[PDB]
Ligand binder design. Structure first.
Ligand SMILES: Cc1cc2nc3c(=O)[nH]c(=O)nc-3n(C[C@H](O)[C@H](O)[C@H](O)COP(=O)(O)OP(=O)(O)OC[C@H]3O[C@@H](n4cnc5c(N)ncnc54)[C@H](O)[C@@H]3O)c2cc1C
Ligand SMILES: Cc1cc2nc3c(=O)[nH]c(=O)nc-3n(C[C@H](O)[C@H](O)[C@H](O)COP(=O)(O)OP(=O)(O)OC[C@H]3O[C@@H](n4cnc5c(N)ncnc54)[C@H](O)[C@@H]3O)c2cc1C
Lengths: 318, 319
């Protein structure tokens, strides 16, 4: 009954959301941003808070920790007038204008909305997966591959996408042998990507299989092996390995929208290519919630900028 | 769906409780159908024990046994006696009618009795740094990991305000140099006794009205080194050096799927008739951590699963 009214409501708190906030606020639109309260089991600030060392975000010659970069983006958004609610959005209503955005505690009436809730890397929860997390297992092959523990030892990658093919190749630069493990006998990845990996000397595919257990050594040591179950024969085999990486995609954060935006089948928001426009006039989508191809902080930042300008431009025509 | 499995006893869950219930139901020739989940609730079939490495207090194993192996044995045992195990997660039940209807994505079972044994899952927070330093300082099992070298003689933090937080705090002062309980309020939910035994502890310091907003490491990409704590009154944020941080903020009983059809306590646990597995619905039983927040052991949960089988067997005979 006491709804905040704003020209621009931003949902999410990664690089996209914050770049959008910076431009919307500087354009004197007084944006309200919902940064979440551990929304989606990711801290406000977004995926970057789950990594330690960001080296490819332009402007930081020495690199910068994700948490610090995102601390900066938020301080910047606040500095220009962004009103940040530390609340998770649970529901929207895009059938009427102004649009309604609500959390547990707050209700906002917004002339435009930027959806920038991002995505989260997918993992499995087979026996041993929590146990050996950061002690062999990880969901970022590229983050951790170089690391000593894996050098010259065998690595496993689970997945059947383009990501799995490329992370597999990437890992054969550090490991002694790489195993791609996939549930089916056929890859979802492009025919090209399948070939570049299948042609790789240090990669061996393990079709028709699932990992059913990860175990360690010692002495409570780090990851030492995985039990793999063939899904045709039923047979279970030990497979020695110092690393296991998840390359099974990313889960775009769109369930809260309850279907009110047109999505692709993988759940990402369908945008007008080369803009942030969605299926609903006045609602925009920026960042990883609508990009599975690049998935970078820098691209997502760019997209957030675009979402602000698009919204600003849509306000002017209305 | 239109080809429903019919059974005297349908068991939902795959921990010690479910499997002991299966072992008894199957041996009593009741041909139980068990839904072990497909990573239901983001825990492997086998249950919480699959998230630990060394179980030392389950009677019968003088040398200890790894959780995964123990639960591999329970399952092989359930199968050996005829249990039909679906590797599927239950999404919905119907307890308004008999036989009871239990369904997963793929299967529908019509059951004369149901044993709910879906257990629980330790709660955690997802502040910045929490995934990062998981197993590299941060953990949800103070008692599992406290002894470990990394923590010896260094400062530890515990988050929570329950009886568990008080006791895990005390337990940690045996290994650390100093222990900090961190809680959102200025008052503890724990019993007045427990609050006193911790507040009286020399090596424990409480950090009221606070939240952890970040965990950071050292080096060189080293292990947990500190946490940023935010006071919720003043707003101030402070660095607090620490080699370990443990979650003692309770357990989440796996009862949402029941969608209200069993009477729950406010914390979500299934309300059972004390000293049995009887629930608010005749013919439906609850065993294990899904209805026990007090003991929470594999051995007690096993005992309770046995009870659920015999209770159901006894209820079939009177019906
Ligand atoms: C391990 C790892 C390492 C990475 N390293 C790099 C790197 O070195 N360089 C690089 O460029 N990129 C890196 N990335 C990728 C980068 O994190 C993402 O590409 C980028 O963060 C996408 O940002 P986004 O703005 O789309 O939001 P995200 O970072 O995905 O954040 C979305 C945020 O919105 C919040 N939210 C979600 N739902 C709601 C809701 N309903 N209401 C309110 N808030 C909500 C979430 O809590 C989340 O904090 C890495 C990713 C990972 C996982
Ligand atoms: C890290 C850790 C270490 C521990 N170490 C010990 C120890 O050494 N000794 C000890 O006695 N106790 C220990 N415990 C506690 C012990 O594991 C639990 O008390 C015990 O497992 C409770 O078992 P349960 O049978 O009630 O169900 P749980 O083990 O909680 O299992 C429930 C299972 O059912 C499945 N499930 C849930 N919902 C559904 C659904 N809807 N459909 C299908 N399947 C579903 C889940 O996937 C899960 O596998 C430990 C706990 C933890 C977390």
């Amino acid at each position: 009954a006491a709804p905040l009214r704003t020209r621009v409501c931003i949902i999410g708190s990664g690089p996209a959301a914050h770049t959008a906030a910076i431009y919307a606020a500087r354009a004197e639109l007084k944006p309200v941003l919902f940064e979440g309260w551990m929304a989606n089991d990711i801290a406000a600030g977004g995926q970057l808070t789950t990594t330690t060392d960001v080296e490819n975000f332009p402007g930081f010659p020495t690199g910068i920790m994700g948490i610090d970069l995102m601390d900066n983006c938020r301080a910047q958004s606040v500095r220009f007038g962004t009103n940040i609610l530390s609340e998770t959005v649970t529901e929207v209503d895009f059938s009427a204008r102004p649009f309604r955005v609500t959390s547990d505690s707050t209700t906002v009436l917004a002339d435009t909305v930027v959806v920038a809730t991002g995505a989260v890397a997918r993992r499995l929860y087979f026996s041993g997966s929590d146990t050996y997390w950061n002690r062999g297992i990880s969901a970022c092959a590229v983050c951790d591959g170089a690391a000593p523990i894996f050098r010259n030892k065998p690595i496993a990658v689970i997945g059947g996408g383009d990501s799995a093919m490329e992370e597999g190749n990437f890992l054969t630069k550090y490991g002694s042998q790489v195993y791609i493990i996939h549930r089916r006998n056929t890859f979802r990845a492009s025919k090209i990507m399948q070939a570049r990996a299948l042609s790789n000397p240090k990669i061996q595919v393990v079709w028709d299989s699932e990992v059913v257990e990860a175990y360690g050594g010692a002495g409570g040591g780090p990851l030492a092996g995985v039990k793999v179950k063939n899904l045709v024969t039923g047979e279970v085999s030990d497979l020695q390995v110092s690393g296991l990486f998840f390359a099974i995609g990313h889960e775009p954060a769109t369930k809260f929208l309850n279907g009110q935006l047109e999505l692709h089948a993988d759940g990402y928001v369908a945008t007008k290519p080369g803009s942030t426009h969605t299926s609903v006039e006045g609602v925009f989508a920026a960042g990883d919630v609508q990009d599975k191809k690049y998935r970078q902080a820098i691209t997502a930042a760019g997209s957030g900028c675009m979402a602000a300008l698009d919204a600003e431009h849509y306000l002017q025509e209305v």
